[PDB]
Amino acid sequence: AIDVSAKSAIIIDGASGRVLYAKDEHQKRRIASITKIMTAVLAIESGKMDQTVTVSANAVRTEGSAIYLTEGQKVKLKDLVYGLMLRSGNDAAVAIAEHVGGSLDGFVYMMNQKAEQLGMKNTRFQNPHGLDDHENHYSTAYDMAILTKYAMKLKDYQKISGTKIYKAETMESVWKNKNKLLTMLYPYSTGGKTGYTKLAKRTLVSTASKDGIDLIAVTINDPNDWDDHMKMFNYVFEHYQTYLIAKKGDIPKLKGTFYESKAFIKRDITYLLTEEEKENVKINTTLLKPKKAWEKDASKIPDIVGHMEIMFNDATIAKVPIYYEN
Template identity: 70%
Template sequence: MKMKWMKLLLIATLLIYCIPQTAQASVSVSAQSAILIEQESGRVLYEKDAYRVSRIASITKIMTAILAIESGQLDEKVKVSENAVRTEGSSIYLKPGEKIRLEDLVYGLMLRSGNDAAVAIAEHVGGSLEGFAYLMNEKAQQIGMENTHFANPHGLDDHEDHMSTAYDMAILTRYAMKNEIYKEIAGTKIHSS
């Protein structure tokens, strides 16, 4: 009799483990829009209003960094303009006339969110802020960012038409993370030139 109950208990236990279980994950995100994608496939794992167009801020600097890296000019010296130095917000404390390697500016852009570095990069790579914004928008279209328009290299809210979506920014980040130099810079905690 005892053996019979043991067998029934074992069969019941096996049946419980064989029945597919479904679980609902509860995710709470305070942002107005958000997205989580899988890097390799690009498959969307979670999204909250990810296609809503809104202003973008410092995440803009991912595009600035990738354009600087892809320019092939990382070893070139950049002469810092008065315009770059006067850029408001976060800074790496550039001085007018200072010459600094483009690669070091990209580190300052990504590690310190340097708005002055963003302007110096834009002026060097694009010839002007307007020229760089043109390059940013060309690259955005090229990689499939259909609901994005860049107006500056840093993300300061000085332009009404500096907009994107969480989905488009995920496309950009996924693209950038395929670049080994970008991955190294973005993963660095401390950099000295």
């Protein structure tokens, strides 16, 4: 079984989003610097990554981890985003927020509107860094997995998150990523983001891939997080595989029927499952009843003749149209 030291934890399938393991995954908690994933997403989506940012006095004042920005410094937004993600710079976070959002209040508005759009119903942002300077800055393991799945759609996020070493284009710094999974511990790691405050304790988001299986893990309040992430990924890689549920082309269960060779699906349907889960998958097809008039005239047969529904217990894990060869 999976046993972790985290108060809340989750691991999800990066392809389908399916929850594979969860522990208190909807409990609102302080999250510390994993907040910064949202800050990075908004910077990347802003289209302003090559713009020059002017660092404010407010940005320099920020407590905690820093990249040592100075008041009035001119730094490319991209550099700040690497500093944010690799070094957890809180100064970088405020500079990004003020640049992309106009003000902290503006940026935080943007963060919450993005959370809403993603369905993060148990998440509320009050700042761009995760310092404990407000009430009601929180998220959950489940919501942070949703956010990370979204972030991993962004090629720039993929790149930044997987970067071990970065030379800034506009600052005299080289930064090493603080994600020990990526830099030293776990060969399958593809990225992630750490957090710590006195009240939040250790928080961690990380991603991993092996044999085409992409996974996302979150732990909130976990003194053993590095080990626990590896345990979680290893458990999934050991016990789950991608099964071809239905192959592209014709549909075996329609053998002997009217649709035996002319009905087809346009793509493979694959899914990440344990051996025991795969036993509980059902392929359901609903098809039009062939009409006598179709025998003589193929033109009366629609292009789509039904749908295939893959069921896992009472979850619909896939649904695709069934076509009829023209």
